[PDB]
């Protein structure tokens, strides 16, 4: 990619290293500024509480004009996230349907995903059956979401 992309990534890795949003961390997997990983802590008072969720964060060649490409590596039980970790979230897509713009950044999208974990959009699901459970049988949703968290997001 370009020098301007390189330069922007150096600045974002700096901010992600020194002022990460609460509950989030993001780092270079090895020596490439565009092959990143992240971690989001399950939020308190959510079924994901105490889980630790890892994600792959790939920065496309045309960043920042295309959004980061992000998927969960740790399985998670959620209306908007599929069994391969694909995430349905507006800021991960370009307009007109999406909301990605170059004034957003790696940190703000990881924060949007963290918020999506607390506040699902059952209206625009990737997982139709989880989405129905969330809407109509919340207690069963919360229970299944805790159990998936215990099974996959707690090595302890």
- Pairing type for strands 24-28 and 35-41 reads antiparallel
Cα dihedral value 128, 73, 32, 41, nearest 10:
100
Per-residue tokens: 78: 């959620």
DSSP 9-46: HHHHHHHHHHSPPTTEEEEESSS-TTEEEEEEEPPTTS
Tell me which long-range contacts 32-37 makes (C-beta under 8 A, separation of at least 24): 33/6, 33/9, 33/59, 34/1, 34/9, 34/58, 34/59, 34/60, 34/63, 35/59, 36/68, 36/106, 37/73
> What CATH class does 1-156 carry?
alpha beta
Q: Between β-strands 24-28 and 52-58, what pairing exists: parallel, antiparallel or unpaired?
A: unpaired
Asked if omega into 96 is within 30° of 0 (cis), the reply is yes
Helix (H) or strand (E) holding 139: helix 138-152
20-24 contacts, C-beta under 8 A, 24 or more apart: 20/107, 21/107, 21/110, 21/111, 21/114, 23/114, 24/107, 24/110, 24/111, 24/114
In the chain, where the domains are located:
1-156
Helix/strand/coil for 148? helix
Do 48 and 142 touch, CB atoms closer than 8 A? no
Indicate which residue of 55, 76, 88, 145 is catalytic: 88
Asked if omega into 64 is within 30° of 0 (cis), the reply is yes
Question: Does 26 participate in catalysis according to the annotation?
Answer: no
Tell the burial category of 57 from Cβ atoms under 10 Å away from its Cβ (0-12, 13-18, 19+).
buried
The owner of tokens 């170059």 is: 102
Listing DSSP states for 124-135 in one string gives S-S-HHHHHHHH
Alpha-carbon gap, residue 62 to 129, rounded angstroms: 35
Q: How was this structure determined?
A: X-ray
Helix (H) or strand (E) holding 149: helix 138-152
- Please give the helix or strand (H or E) that residue 117 lies within, else none: helix 106-118
């Amino acid at each position: 990619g370009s020098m301007q992309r390189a330069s922007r990534l150096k600045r974002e890795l700096h901010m992600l290293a020194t002022e990460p949003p609460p509950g989030i961390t993001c780092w270079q997997d090895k020596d490439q500024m565009d092959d990143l990983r992240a971690q989001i802590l399950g939020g308190a008072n959510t079924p994901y509480e105490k889980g630790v969720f890892k994600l792959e964060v790939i920065i496309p060649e045309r960043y920042p004009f295309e959004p980061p490409q992000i998927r969960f590596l740790t399985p998670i039980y959620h209306p908007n996230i599929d069994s391969a970790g694909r995430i349905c979230l507006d800021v991960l897509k370009l307009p007109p349907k999406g909301a990605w713009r170059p004034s957003l950044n790696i940190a703000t999208v990881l924060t949007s995903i963290q918020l999506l974990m607390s506040e699902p959009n059952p209206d625009d699901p990737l997982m139709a059956d989880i989405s129905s459970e969330f809407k109509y049988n919340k207690p069963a949703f919360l229970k299944n979401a805790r159990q998936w968290t215990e099974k996959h997001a707690r090595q302890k």
